[PDB]
């Protein structure tokens, strides 16, 4: 049903990612029409004498070649008839079946136009694939309450490293289901995901407030994620330099529709009155739900206009235990980064919203932060990338040297002992046994660099 391509433009795209450093080239790009085509190509890789590398590519947003298949085949999962959202009296809510390669922006537009429904857990940027985010976690300001996107999926169709098509969920083949979720593409290619949906809000009251005190900023973020009961629907934060001394910006939203429109003003005021931000630093925006969710695509268009999008992105994302966040500000925000461009995001989440059976690796603490260092190197300036990479290593060295039990989100580890350390003994054993069962020849997502044939 599908086709192998050797088009130079296809080979070039499959040989690069948003990180802009890793450049491992495949022999061909596979364009599947349906799941059976993906199964055929993986089956052929498993049956071949050589056992060539096969990796699915979502939207190519990896930082360090995780979707690259050196001298093998890259499956271009990008987009056919779409399934309509479905109501279930047994689940007590809606769901939608989507193709693994579908972009979250296309999922949103589809579900809104078919019943005004939408996923309840997001990423900040919607031009990412469903299979791509579900293989990591999929995190944004809703995760503290709904959990990440891996906690908002009922079922999957997975093409294993043996080319077998398996339907899995908590009740059917749970080992494969939980293994694949946060699994870094190690156990199969997601061809279908059954996404949980809620009736979508119509509008968003988007708030930002400034802080000069890190203890008050984090104390307010930790109180907000423990609510209610009156609560915000989104809790994020970011670090700001004195020009435009360190400032911290709290970012929150209150979702509303036609029914709740008359209570949104007082709900926001009651919640904000209980906080400790700097007086006269509250900024507010009122806009449609789709416009708020697509806010990063707008930042993207302004960057493409300045030739500042197709630059190297040495991004570093860390999960930091809440017990060590104060030390982190002193040593990193004030220390390492004290004194190319890019935001530094920071906000806490609740570990109980993360299913411990999945492959995702979080710190061993109930409340932990995501600290996202989203810095870009200067265009056509290799020394800018090098200096940023040295700063990232200084951040990891700081965590190592002070015993902060941080974990990398989207891990960029190379060595086997680095992966052993990342997972820990119990999780590593579970991970390796799943690999022996579902991808014994290490064909899938070899660009992650965890296993070898
Ligand atoms: C570039 C970027 C990334 C990003 C983001 C904003 C931008 C500009 N904002 C994020 C956010 O708010 N929250 C979050 O959790 N992540 C965010 N990211 C990172 C993003 O999630 C990752 O880059 C992730 O890899 C998804 O991106 P993408 O869809 O482009 O996938 P990929 O890079 O090609 O593949 C990543 C790994 O997954 C495997 N893969 C890909 N598709 C599948 C399927 N269908 N099944 C199984 N495995 C799959 C790849 O082989 C690779 O190992
Ligand atoms: O990339 C983002 N968010 C984002 C927000 C505003 C501007 C952004 O910079 C960009 F260049 F416009 F993409 C990125 N988040 C992300 C990235 C990787 C891993 C996890 C996250 C979630 C942090 O909230």
């Amino acid at each position: 049903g599908g086709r192998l391509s050797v088009d130079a433009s296809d080979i070039a795209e499959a040989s690069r990612d948003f990180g802009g450093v890793a450049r491992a080239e495949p022999m061909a790009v596979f364009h599947p029409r349906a799941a059976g085509d993906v199964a055929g190509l993986v089956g052929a890789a498993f049956r071949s004498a050589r056992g060539f590398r096969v990796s699915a590519r979502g939207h190519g947003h990896s930082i360090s070649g995780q979707a690259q298949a050196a001298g093998g085949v890259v499956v271009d999962m990008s987009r056919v008839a779409r399934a309509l959202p479905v109501h279930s009296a047994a689940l007590g809510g809606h769901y939608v079946d989507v193709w693994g390669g579908e972009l979250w922006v296309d999922v949103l537009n589809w579900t809104l136009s078919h019943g005004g429904l939408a996923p309840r857990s997001w990423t900040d940027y919607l031009y990412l694939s469903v299979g791509g985010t579900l293989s990591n976690a999929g995190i944004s300001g809703q995760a503290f309450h709904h959990g990440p996107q891996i906690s908002n999926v009922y079922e999957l169709d997975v093409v294993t490293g043996k080319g077998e098509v398996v339907t899995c969920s908590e009740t059917e083949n749970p080992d494969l289901f939980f293994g694949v979720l946060g699994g870094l593409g190690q156990f199969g290619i997601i061809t279908r995901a059954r996404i949980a949906l809620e009736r979508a809000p119509k509008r968003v009251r988007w708030i930002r407030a400034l802080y000069s005190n890190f203890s008050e900023f984090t104390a307010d973020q930790e109180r907000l994620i423990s609510l209610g009961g009156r609560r915000f629907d989104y809790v994020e934060g970011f670090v700001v330099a004195a020009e435009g001394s360190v400032l911290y910006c709290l970012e929150v939203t209150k979702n509303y529709d036609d029914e709740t429109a008359g209570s949104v003003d007082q709900d926001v005021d009651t919640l904000l009155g209980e906080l400790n931000f700097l007086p006269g630093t509250v900024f507010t925006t009122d806009l449609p739900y789709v416009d708020f969710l697509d806010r990063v695509h707008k930042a993207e268009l302004k960057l493409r206009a300045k030739g500042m999008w197709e630059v190297p992105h040495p991004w570093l994302n860390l999960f930091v235990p809440a017990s060590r966040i104060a030390d982190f500000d002193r040593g990193v925000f004030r220390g390492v980064l004290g004194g190319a461009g890019g935001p530094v995001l920071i906000y806490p989440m609740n570990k109980h919203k993360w299913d411990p059976r999945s492959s995702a690796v979080t710190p061993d603490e109930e409340v932990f932060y995501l600290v996202a260092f989203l810095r870009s190197a200067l265009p056509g300036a290799p020394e800018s990338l090098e200096a940023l990479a040295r700063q990232n290593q200084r951040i990891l060295d700081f965590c190592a040297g002070t015993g902060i039990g941080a974990k990398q989100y989207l891990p960029g580890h190379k060595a086997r002992h680095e992966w052993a350390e990342h997972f820990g003994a119990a999780r590593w054993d579970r991970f390796a046994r799943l690999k022996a069962e579902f991808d014994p020849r290490a064909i899938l997502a070899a660009g992650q660099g965890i296993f070898r044939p």
Side-chain angles (χ1 to χ4, degrees), residues 124 139 236 296 299 303 309 315 317 343 345 347 370 372 374 409-410:
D124 295 343
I139 309 167
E236 288 197 17
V296 182
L303 286 162
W309 179 259
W315 288 5
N317 303 282
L345 314 188
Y347 53 96
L370 167 57
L374 311 177
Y409 174 50
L410 313 173

CSV table of all heavy atoms in Angstrom, one decimal, residues 124 139 236 296 299 303 309 315 317 343 345 347 370 372 374 409-410, ligand 2:
chain,number,residue,atom,x,y,z
A,124,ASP,N,2.8,22.7,25.0
A,124,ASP,CA,2.8,24.2,24.7
A,124,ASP,C,2.7,24.4,23.2
A,124,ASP,O,2.1,25.4,22.8
A,124,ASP,CB,4.1,24.9,25.2
A,124,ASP,CG,4.4,24.9,26.7
A,124,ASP,OD1,3.5,24.6,27.5
A,124,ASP,OD2,5.6,25.1,27.0
A,139,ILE,N,3.8,17.3,28.0
A,139,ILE,CA,3.6,18.2,29.1
A,139,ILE,C,3.3,19.6,28.8
A,139,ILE,O,3.9,20.2,27.9
A,139,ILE,CB,4.8,18.1,30.0
A,139,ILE,CG1,5.2,16.6,30.3
A,139,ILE,CG2,4.7,18.8,31.4
A,139,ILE,CD1,6.7,16.4,31.0
A,236,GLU,N,1.8,27.6,34.7
A,236,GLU,CA,3.2,27.6,34.2
A,236,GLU,C,4.0,28.8,34.9
A,236,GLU,O,3.5,29.4,35.8
A,236,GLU,CB,3.4,27.6,32.7
A,236,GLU,CG,3.0,26.2,32.1
A,236,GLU,CD,3.5,26.0,30.7
A,236,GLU,OE1,4.4,26.8,30.2
A,236,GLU,OE2,2.9,25.1,30.0
A,296,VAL,N,2.2,29.3,20.7
A,296,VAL,CA,3.6,29.1,20.3
A,296,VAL,C,3.8,29.1,18.8
A,296,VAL,O,4.8,29.5,18.3
A,296,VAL,CB,4.2,27.8,21.1
A,296,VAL,CG1,5.7,27.6,20.7
A,296,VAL,CG2,4.0,28.0,22.6
A,299,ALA,N,4.5,32.6,17.9
A,299,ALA,CA,5.9,32.9,18.2
A,299,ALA,C,6.8,32.3,17.1
A,299,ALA,O,7.8,33.0,16.7
A,299,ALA,CB,6.3,32.3,19.6
A,303,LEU,N,9.5,34.2,14.4
A,303,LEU,CA,10.9,33.7,14.3
A,303,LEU,C,11.3,33.3,12.9
A,303,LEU,O,12.5,33.6,12.5
A,303,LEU,CB,11.1,32.5,15.2
A,303,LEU,CG,11.2,32.8,16.8
A,303,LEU,CD1,10.9,31.5,17.6
A,303,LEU,CD2,12.5,33.4,17.2
A,309,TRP,N,14.4,30.6,13.2
A,309,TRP,CA,13.7,29.3,13.5
A,309,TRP,C,14.6,28.1,13.2
A,309,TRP,O,14.7,27.3,14.0
A,309,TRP,CB,12.4,29.3,12.8
A,309,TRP,CG,11.6,28.0,13.1
A,309,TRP,CD1,11.5,27.0,12.2
A,309,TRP,CD2,10.8,27.7,14.3
A,309,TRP,NE1,10.7,26.0,12.8
A,309,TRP,CE2,10.3,26.4,14.0
A,309,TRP,CE3,10.6,28.3,15.5
A,309,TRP,CZ2,9.5,25.8,15.0
A,309,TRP,CZ3,9.8,27.7,16.4
A,309,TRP,CH2,9.3,26.4,16.2
A,315,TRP,N,18.3,22.3,23.4
A,315,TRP,CA,17.3,22.3,24.5
A,315,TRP,C,17.6,21.3,25.6
A,315,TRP,O,17.9,20.1,25.3
A,315,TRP,CB,15.9,22.2,23.9
A,315,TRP,CG,15.4,23.4,23.2
A,315,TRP,CD1,16.1,24.5,22.9
A,315,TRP,CD2,14.1,23.6,22.7
A,315,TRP,NE1,15.3,25.5,22.3
A,315,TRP,CE2,14.0,24.9,22.2
A,315,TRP,CE3,12.9,22.8,22.7
A,315,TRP,CZ2,12.9,25.5,21.7
A,315,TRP,CZ3,11.8,23.4,22.2
A,315,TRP,CH2,11.7,24.7,21.7
A,317,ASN,N,15.8,19.8,29.2
A,317,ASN,CA,14.6,19.7,30.0
A,317,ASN,C,14.9,18.8,31.2
A,317,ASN,O,15.2,17.6,31.0
A,317,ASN,CB,13.4,19.2,29.2
A,317,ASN,CG,13.1,20.1,28.0
A,317,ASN,OD1,12.6,21.2,28.1
A,317,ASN,ND2,13.6,19.7,26.8
A,343,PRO,N,13.6,31.2,26.0
A,343,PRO,CA,13.0,31.1,27.4
A,343,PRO,C,13.5,30.0,28.3
A,343,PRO,O,14.0,29.0,27.8
A,343,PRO,CB,11.5,31.0,27.1
A,343,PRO,CG,11.4,30.3,25.8
A,343,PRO,CD,12.6,30.7,25.0
A,345,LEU,N,11.5,28.0,31.2
A,345,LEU,CA,10.2,27.7,31.8
A,345,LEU,C,10.4,26.9,33.1
A,345,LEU,O,11.3,26.1,33.2
A,345,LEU,CB,9.2,27.0,30.8
A,345,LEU,CG,9.1,27.6,29.4
A,345,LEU,CD1,7.9,26.9,28.7
A,345,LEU,CD2,8.8,29.1,29.4
A,347,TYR,N,7.8,25.1,36.4
A,347,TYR,CA,6.5,24.9,37.1
A,347,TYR,C,6.4,23.5,37.7
A,347,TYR,O,7.0,22.6,37.1
A,347,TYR,CB,5.3,25.2,36.1
A,347,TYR,CG,5.3,24.5,34.8
A,347,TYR,CD1,4.6,23.3,34.7
A,347,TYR,CD2,5.9,25.0,33.7
A,347,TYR,CE1,4.5,22.6,33.4
A,347,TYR,CE2,5.9,24.3,32.5
A,347,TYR,CZ,5.2,23.2,32.3
A,347,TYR,OH,5.1,22.5,31.1
A,370,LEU,N,9.3,20.8,36.3
A,370,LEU,CA,9.8,20.7,35.0
A,370,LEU,C,10.6,22.0,34.8
A,370,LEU,O,10.0,23.1,35.1
A,370,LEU,CB,8.8,20.6,33.8
A,370,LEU,CG,9.3,20.8,32.4
A,370,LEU,CD1,10.5,19.8,32.0
A,370,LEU,CD2,8.1,20.6,31.4
A,372,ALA,N,12.6,23.8,31.9
A,372,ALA,CA,12.9,23.8,30.5
A,372,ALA,C,13.8,24.9,30.0
A,372,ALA,O,13.4,26.1,30.0
A,372,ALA,CB,11.5,23.7,29.7
A,374,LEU,N,15.1,26.4,27.0
A,374,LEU,CA,14.7,26.4,25.6
A,374,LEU,C,15.5,27.5,24.9
A,374,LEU,O,14.9,28.4,24.3
A,374,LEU,CB,13.2,26.6,25.5
A,374,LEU,CG,12.3,25.7,26.3
A,374,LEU,CD1,10.9,25.9,26.1
A,374,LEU,CD2,12.6,24.2,26.0
A,409,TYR,N,14.0,14.9,31.0
A,409,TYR,CA,12.8,14.7,30.2
A,409,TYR,C,13.4,14.8,28.7
A,409,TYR,O,14.2,15.6,28.5
A,409,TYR,CB,11.7,15.8,30.4
A,409,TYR,CG,10.5,15.7,29.5
A,409,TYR,CD1,9.9,14.4,29.3
A,409,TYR,CD2,10.0,16.8,28.8
A,409,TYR,CE1,8.8,14.3,28.4
A,409,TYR,CE2,8.9,16.7,27.9
A,409,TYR,CZ,8.3,15.4,27.8
A,409,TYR,OH,7.2,15.3,26.9
A,410,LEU,N,12.9,13.9,27.8
A,410,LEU,CA,13.5,13.7,26.4
A,410,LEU,C,15.0,13.4,26.6
A,410,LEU,O,15.8,14.1,26.1
A,410,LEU,CB,13.3,15.0,25.6
A,410,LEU,CG,11.9,15.7,25.6
A,410,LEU,CD1,11.9,17.0,24.9
A,410,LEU,CD2,10.8,14.8,25.1
B,2,LIG,O1,9.0,24.4,23.8
B,2,LIG,C1,8.2,24.6,24.8
B,2,LIG,N1,7.4,25.8,24.9
B,2,LIG,C2,7.6,27.0,24.2
B,2,LIG,C3,6.9,28.1,24.8
B,2,LIG,C4,7.1,29.4,24.2
B,2,LIG,C5,8.1,29.6,23.2
B,2,LIG,C6,8.8,28.5,22.7
B,2,LIG,O2,9.9,28.7,21.8
B,2,LIG,C7,9.6,28.5,20.5
B,2,LIG,F1,10.8,28.7,19.9
B,2,LIG,F2,8.7,29.4,20.1
B,2,LIG,F3,9.2,27.2,20.2
B,2,LIG,C8,8.6,27.2,23.3
B,2,LIG,N2,8.0,23.6,25.8
B,2,LIG,C9,8.6,22.3,25.9
B,2,LIG,C10,9.7,21.9,25.1
B,2,LIG,C11,10.3,20.7,25.3
B,2,LIG,C12,9.9,19.9,26.4
B,2,LIG,C13,8.9,20.4,27.2
B,2,LIG,C14,8.3,21.6,27.0
B,2,LIG,C15,7.2,22.0,28.0
B,2,LIG,C16,7.6,23.2,28.9
B,2,LIG,O3,6.5,23.9,29.3
